[PDB]
Amino acid sequence: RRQPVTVLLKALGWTNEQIVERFGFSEIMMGTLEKDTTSGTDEALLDIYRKLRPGEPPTKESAQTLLENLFFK
Amino acid sequence: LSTLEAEMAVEKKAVEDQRDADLEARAQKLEADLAELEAEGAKSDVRRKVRDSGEREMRQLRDRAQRELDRLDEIWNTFTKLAPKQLIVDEVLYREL
Amino acid sequence: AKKAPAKRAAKSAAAKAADSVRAYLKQIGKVALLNAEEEVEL
């Protein structure tokens, strides 16, 4: 729990303007990114990494492949 | 407690002296290098990216010295307030204690 | 990534935190692999 849907949309590497571009008519789509404090796409992967794999200090090689391997792979 | 605090102060100071010594050397190096950059005709944005890179390498040196100053303060605070039933999860800290 | 590498220091937040084998792997990971010269030394 405690996971905003916006923090992951940035985890793919999409910049916020894309959120404002794709979200559009969605008001809570902007307010969720407006409330979310995650700055950067790699920092959001880290907030996702410690919630998904608690106990293991991550690596930029492991932080990126985690999301890719989980679903897309 | 007296001799311990006294040995901790010197230790924390020795780290401080070093941070200063190291930080002034990296600054003079950047002064020397921005000097050659003006000696030759050098694009303005190139002279600033040398300072930007040089400024950032300094923040690293200070941050690292700060980390050790905090690690040392954590050691001393922990040991002075130390009481039975307290829990120590660091184990690198615990080893230092 | 100069301010990101300081965020990669969240690896420190991980070393402070369910499975028993995960627990044992965390600790054996803290040591460092020797090369041929050190093995002889030891």
From Swiss-Prot, chain A:
Protein known as = DNA-directed RNA polymerase subunit beta
Domain of life, per lineage:
Bacteria
Q: Which residues of the full protein are shown?
A: 221 to 293 of 1169
| Leftover remarks | Mutations in the RRDR sequence (residues 423-449) confer rifampicin (Rif) resistance. Rif blocks transcription initiation but not elongation.
Gene name, Swiss-Prot/TrEMBL? rpoB
Q: Which family does it belong to?
A: Belongs to the RNA polymerase beta chain family.
Assembly and oligomerization: The RNAP catalytic core consists of 2 alpha, 1 beta, 1 beta' and 1 omega subunit. When a sigma factor is associated with the core the holoenzyme is formed, which can initiate transcription. Interacts with RbpA, which partially restores Rif-inhibited transcription.
Q: What does this protein do?
A: DNA-dependent RNA polymerase catalyzes the transcription of DNA into RNA using the four ribonucleoside triphosphates as substrates. This subunit often mutates to generate rifampicin (Rif) resistance. Interaction with RbpA partially restores Rif-inhibited transcription; once the subunit is Rif-resistant however RbpA no longer stimulates transcription.
Curated annotation (Swiss-Prot), chain B:
Q: Which residues cross the membrane?
A: none
The domain of life for this entry's organism is Bacteria
Q: What does this protein do?
A: DNA-dependent RNA polymerase catalyzes the transcription of DNA into RNA using the four ribonucleoside triphosphates as substrates.
| Family of the protein in this entry | Belongs to the RNA polymerase beta' chain family.
Complexes and interactors: The RNAP catalytic core consists of 2 alpha, 1 beta, 1 beta' and 1 omega subunit. When a sigma factor is associated with the core the holoenzyme is formed, which can initiate transcription.
Q: What is this protein called?
A: DNA-directed RNA polymerase subunit beta'
Which species is this record about?
A: Mycolicibacterium smegmatis (strain ATCC 700084 / mc(2)155) (Mycobacterium smegmatis)
- Which region of the full protein is contained in this chain? 148 to 244 of 1317
